[PDB]
Design a protein around this ligand. Sequence first.
Ligand SMILES: Nc1ncnc2c1ncn2[C@@H]1O[C@H](COP(=O)(O)OP(=O)(O)NP(=O)(O)O)[C@@H](O)[C@H]1O
Ligand SMILES: [Mg+2]
Lengths: 88, 1177, 628
Amino acid sequence: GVQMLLRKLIEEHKQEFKVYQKASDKSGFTAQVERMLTEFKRYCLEPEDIRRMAESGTAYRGERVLSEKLHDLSILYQQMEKSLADQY
Amino acid sequence: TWTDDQWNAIVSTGQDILVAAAAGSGKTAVLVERMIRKITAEENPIDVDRLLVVTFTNASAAEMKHRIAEALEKELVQRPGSLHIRRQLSLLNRASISTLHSFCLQVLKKYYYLIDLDPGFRIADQTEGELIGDEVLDELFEDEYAKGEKAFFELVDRYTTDRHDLDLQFLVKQVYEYSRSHPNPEAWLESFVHLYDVSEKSAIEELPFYQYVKEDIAMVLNGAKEKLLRALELTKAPGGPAPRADNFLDDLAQIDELIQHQDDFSELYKRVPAVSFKRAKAVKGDEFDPALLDEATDLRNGAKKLLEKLKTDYFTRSPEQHLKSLAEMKPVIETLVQLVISYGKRFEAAKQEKSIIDFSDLEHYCLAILTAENDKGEREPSEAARFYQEQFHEVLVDEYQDTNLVQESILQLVTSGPEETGNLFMVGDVKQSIYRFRLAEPLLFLSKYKRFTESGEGTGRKIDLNKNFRSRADILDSTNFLFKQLMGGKIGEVDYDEQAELKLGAAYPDNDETETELLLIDELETVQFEAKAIAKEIRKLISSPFKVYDGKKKTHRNIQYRDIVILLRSMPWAPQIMEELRAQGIPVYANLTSGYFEAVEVAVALSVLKVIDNPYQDIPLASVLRSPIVGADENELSLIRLENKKAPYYEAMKDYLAAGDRSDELYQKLNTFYGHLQKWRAFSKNHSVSELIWEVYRDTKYMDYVGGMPGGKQRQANLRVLYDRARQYESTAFRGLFRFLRFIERMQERGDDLGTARGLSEQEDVVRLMTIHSSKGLEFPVVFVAGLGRNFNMMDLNKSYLLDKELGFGTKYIHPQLRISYPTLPLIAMKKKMRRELLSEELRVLYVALTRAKEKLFLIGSCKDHQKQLAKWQASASQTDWLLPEFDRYQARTYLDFIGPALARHRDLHADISGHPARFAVQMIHSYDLLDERMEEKSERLEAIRRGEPVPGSFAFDEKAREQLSWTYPHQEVTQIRTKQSVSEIKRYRRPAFMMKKGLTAAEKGTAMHTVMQHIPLSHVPSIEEAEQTVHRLYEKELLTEEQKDAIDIEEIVQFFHTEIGGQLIGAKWKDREIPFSLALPAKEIYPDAHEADEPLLVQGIIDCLYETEDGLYLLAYKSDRIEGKFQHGFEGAAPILKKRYETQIQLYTKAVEQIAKTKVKGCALYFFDGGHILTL
Amino acid sequence: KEVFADYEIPYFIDGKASMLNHPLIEFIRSSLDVLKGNWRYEAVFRCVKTELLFPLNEPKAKVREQVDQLENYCIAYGIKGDRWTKGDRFQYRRFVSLDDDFAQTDQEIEMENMLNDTRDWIVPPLFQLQKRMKKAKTVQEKAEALYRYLEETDVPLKLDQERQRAEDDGRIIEAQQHQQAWDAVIQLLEEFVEMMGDDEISLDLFQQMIEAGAESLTFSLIPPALDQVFVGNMDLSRMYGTSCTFVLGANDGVLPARPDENGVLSDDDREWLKTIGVELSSGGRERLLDEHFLIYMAFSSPSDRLYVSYPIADAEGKTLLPSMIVKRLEELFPHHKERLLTNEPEQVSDEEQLMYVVNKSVAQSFTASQLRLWTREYDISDVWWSTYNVLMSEQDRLQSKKLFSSLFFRNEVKQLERSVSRQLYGERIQGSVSRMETFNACPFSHFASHGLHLKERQFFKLEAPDIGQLFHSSLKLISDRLRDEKLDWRDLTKEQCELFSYDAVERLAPKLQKEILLSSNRHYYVKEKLQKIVTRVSGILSEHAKASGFVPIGLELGFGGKGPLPPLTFQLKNGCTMELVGRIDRVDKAESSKGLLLRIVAYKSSDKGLDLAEVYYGLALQMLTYLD
DNA sequence: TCTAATGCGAGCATGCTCGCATTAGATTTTGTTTTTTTAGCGGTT
Ligand SMILES: Nc1ncnc2c1ncn2[C@@H]1O[C@H](COP(=O)(O)OP(=O)(O)NP(=O)(O)O)[C@@H](O)[C@H]1O
Ligand SMILES: [Mg+2]
């Protein structure tokens, strides 16, 4: 159910991505994102934390890439919690 | 014990390193120890996951992993305190030691997002991917025909036959495939037109392809010149003919006249068809020599044929005509290029949709990921490439002489920097490259050998290893003797000079035995004679034990079958050989890639599957019937037909079942089979093909049956991998009987095949029949090389078109309307060039084959006539040079055409050549000599088996076997009994949400009631409004959904508290609610036949209420049952019935509290919301 | 599952099973595939074969047989796409001949009726689904379209029937899983409309998501029994009071396990994320180390006995290596002997071979192979002579005997009895030269062919014989037209050759192989190719006629049966008469000094002529028969 | 599909090569490559 929600959100905000645009097309991708965000929740990391980590990144060899990823993930994450807030 | 050069290779750093050396130089060993040394270093330590080792085979990778782990352990024994080495032993499972394909797979998996690839992609089965390709080729062709463009028809007409267009299909496939061996396939495809961009004004000699024409001409004219010179020499001999000299000298002059014009194609067009040899001057007298007389004429006629061949090749049309034809073909090529490009784009789109990739997509997608910017072949490294550059300190490549351009690109992007100061270590041997059929480029190696210097200053360093540590001197000398005469320049692509010759370095105690043997063999198959000879000599090796020396251990061991290895160039002959060796009694193992569906067991088992799929297939049905599965004989079969002639065979079978009587045997066979058939058909609908196949096996016992007939081991293996193959295909894309069968049929129709299953594992003591290609990098004590008299496969030359890595697409000039075709110049050039390349590689194949051996080498080849071939061998061997005549080597069609003449100048069949320290044992066998029944001992047991009666008497294990076969598990009955049980169970399809009336589910109401009943304060009896304030305390805290809240009778809830039992509850010393419990109950109570040793069942439940008054402990339950609505006596009709409805449950609950708390409960009450009734139990 | 089934060992697997084999799941998937790919053969018949389209309360066996013959029909006539939903009835002919045009027999009518009747219950639910689906724009109305599709085909009722049928057979678990399949599907749809119900999406995205959902579906865990072997894993499984433990597949690369790093966040991503103070799940690096603890817990789990096994080879025979753990164990227990696990009992001790006889089937299976080995002059264990003997003592030794009759198995055929032969082939044998040739090639082939009349499954595909028939018939039509216009082959012009040839192929095309030359554009071009061939052949015959003194008398002449010439006949010992009837391609007459001359001409599609060797062995008899 | 054998006649040095044409035979592939993590039900309907 969350995966489907993700796919929806992905279609809606794919234009805002910095690195996962090419992959947002793929079905495997939404599964990956779902697993990632679930891990985030299991390790007590709210959307704002993820945003913050991204911002920290923008300014380690793969820091640029990682920050891009975390940015896209944070858009999907935050949007998810928005969509789920008072109903699910 | 490392050689100086070896150590140089093991320690050298700072720059790209190429290690070039012949066979058995320790290149692979050097590589391993370089790795070890790098990791296990006191001075500077690096982790194993900081190196990239790319091997050729997965086995080689695993082998490296172990040969490493052991060294790590020795280092650990010597240094226990080491934290590092300890960690390295662990990192070995995280190590990048594999094939390049595996590395590509890791790249795609991690950086999928950089390209258009699904992270959950999978690599397609060979046939699967090919089928996808076949489909899109069909779609594409239909679209082109639909469009009906004139260009398309102009192409089809030229490259298809007169009734179908399959050849064009194959053509597209082949061209696409070839193009995929370049880093930029499209660009290579678009370079096609340039070969055809000529005019009548163009200068032939300046055109690229003409290079290969030039050489050919230069080779044949000289080839004739020499051929005449010999004839001239034959004039000087005493018995030789003197008067014919003036003939030869004339011909020579004429041929020499052509040689002065080799460079000018036009002049050659003028002179070559104008050359005529004056009539042979007859020499009459007995002073001459009839043999020599008739031999010189052969040489002269040889010159004639060479010239005529040159003429028909190049000079039957003017250069202007040739160029006009070539230019004419240009538009057709342009259409072909565009067609192949559409195919690819479509093929990729197809594979993308199913989220799969080629085996070929691995390389190309990896390369895509590694590049960011590509400028005319200049690839700038992407982020992924930088990552892999930093992660890997060094990149190690073995078998580099078989690297291809795509792989090389990937290596160039993962390695760190320019050649001069890079981290690319590579070992290999040009002489051993055997994968040009797979478009590998050994020239990649060669160019790097030429650019590199021993000094390695400003460039990369090359390192030579001269010593051979693998084999005995007999092998090395035999090899070196053969290849100084064969491999050179045009044929071999490499000089077999002193630096490249094998040099003894291994210590081996002597043997008279190790002589290299050549066995020439003169209504029986030739392969059978060869196999007979092989087996014979193998038995000779076994009868008196050959001694096998372990160079490292320095300890001998008796000869084992696992020491003998038979190498073949091609495996068509392998089956017959295996059969013959088994006839002689020798154990054989050969890894096969074909013949699976020819196995009768496979055919029959498949037939069962098809019949289960659709019984209305006469032949698969009849097949299953006549098979041992049913066992109907010919009379019984024809009997089935008789019931119904016009109908399908299945119908006839049905009818015989309908009319037949239970007394007959045939009816019983057919009735059993039909019952089985129906069982299986039902079975296929909710089970996989695999489960079906295993079930068919256990119902028919067909695997059991075939295991007891000849070849049984193999047969059971076949049926086994039928199961396993099914499991793989199910797992992947063909789940279910129908899809699986379809896949198998589609596969077979293509011309694809699977290999027969391996009955025995490799590690067992058997003689291995393998291809020479499988042999590389390996060493074996004794080695056979058979099929030497067999022709080279050069079918590629014969087609109307040819593909070339350098030149592209060569074709015949083809005019569909005029009905004429003839080779264009670049086609002939590409043909000649291809023959050269092919021959050179076959030589390298032979080199690998011979260098495999350690101590013994057998060469078996067959021939029509010994003396004729010996004569021809001599004819090619009269030269004083080591290297045989270039043209003669160019004319070779079989391996014997190489080995023969090179073996002719040897003593065993010029002192430098004749006296070479190579020993050859020549056997001139004829078929009849190879050609060379046992005691008839009856067996009581065999016939007793036939009868079905037992074997006479009293074996040791009779008693124990009796005991086991009649054994039954004591606790059998309780093996199926579920442990956890429901209180409801002990007594023992819904629409979606968006299709229903919203809300107010009947059970929901009851559950709601329950929740309030358990969260209501029990301090005192509440008011009717009080309970409601409780309810929006509950709604707010979301304990009950507002939907549930809306549906609640507040009066019904309050009413219970007015009643005397409820009054007791509020006025209770102690009270508790929603009390869950688990209770153990001996299985016997719920199930008869159970036992005390047999575990108790667990029964869980939730008790609504429990309260303790001064008198005792009481149980309370609530039911949202419907009472007042439908009972004749109302509650009093309900009361006996309700008591029944919950009696079992209550008895279980009371048993729980009674057992666990060990306190008897005085009374139990059932409160019903409907009517407020309370039933006492 | 299968092995422990055969060795009668009760087990509990710590894992859920897939629904991907269930008829409902495949029904939905294949149905959507029917829509997406426009009624391709494979999709449609996947769908049909799940049996959920079957007419309610009709006998599934009979329905199946009907579908089967429909399927053969579709394959033979190349039915796909629009042809399914066209109004036209599927037309059926048992055999179509180019030369002679025939009226539909009564059997053919009966068949045609059956085929179309089967079609008429297949198409509507699928057709209606397709219609509803094109019209549905949002996730919810597509989900509703699909669910309605399930409702209208009475899927819940059919599945419930299945539940009961299974329960009656005692298959409680297999019966329980049907309702699981239904509830799973309904939940899938429910969620889909819950998250994206109002969003408009394409059919491709819908099918994609539905498929992604169904791939993840799993049945519930089978509840544990009172006495089961526990089969599970090493990462998540928990046990208690275990007495014996078998650790399996202790292979290199397997144990310890190579972790797969691949997620959104790399190992180096995670490792760096740690240094900046954010903690996530263990990256692969750590897990690879925790493998030691896993193996430690696995090894110290039993109280009494521990087994550590590893296979050396693949299912395909690929070599598997023993892990480091095996060596490590060899170090800690250097005097322990390693035991061999093989399906070749000969390779172990008699005491171990005795372990093999666990029940009657296992025993039968191993005994038969041991018997084979024995016949190959090898000493099989006493265990197998004991076993064989008990098997022969037991109640139904006839079965074991049948199994062991493999020891003397040969591929033998029993000669046909006089009465059977008489009935099959008849008292009078009507034949063709080709039948005789078939027999001379191989008697059994002739038996399967002209005896049993076994037909191979027909395919919508242009083979060589069809093309041959086309050529023959074409030349016939041309010749006839030539005589009707008082024209002779000599007087033909190039223009006339082209015109006649094209016309002839045009005429014959709709009759050739189920109208396959009209089937596609590619086949249109095939037709053109054939036209070009016939054209050139026409011209060639015209040139040959201008240089030959031989004049064609009869073309496609018939001897025997209907044809004017009488059948050549033979008499037999049996008292049976064998008459052979056939058709000569061409016969030419000439006038000469020696007399009237006759020659026979045959139109063939191969360059090869007549081999006397093949004549001697009875492989090539047609020509000399025609001449005779 | 290319190499080899067979047949016949013209030009040359009555018997021999050579040209040419043609057919007929037989003779015939090699190959490798993965894993997908991530905590059993549910008493009461
Ligand atoms: N310095 C040495 N001392 C002793 N034995 C050696 C030495 N170098 C190599 N060998 C042995 O010689 C054999 C050949 O070594 P190998 O590593 O296969 O070389 P290679 O160049 O890779 N052979 P190849 O791949 O076919 O070209 C192996 O069995 C080694 O153990
Ligand atoms: Mg090597």
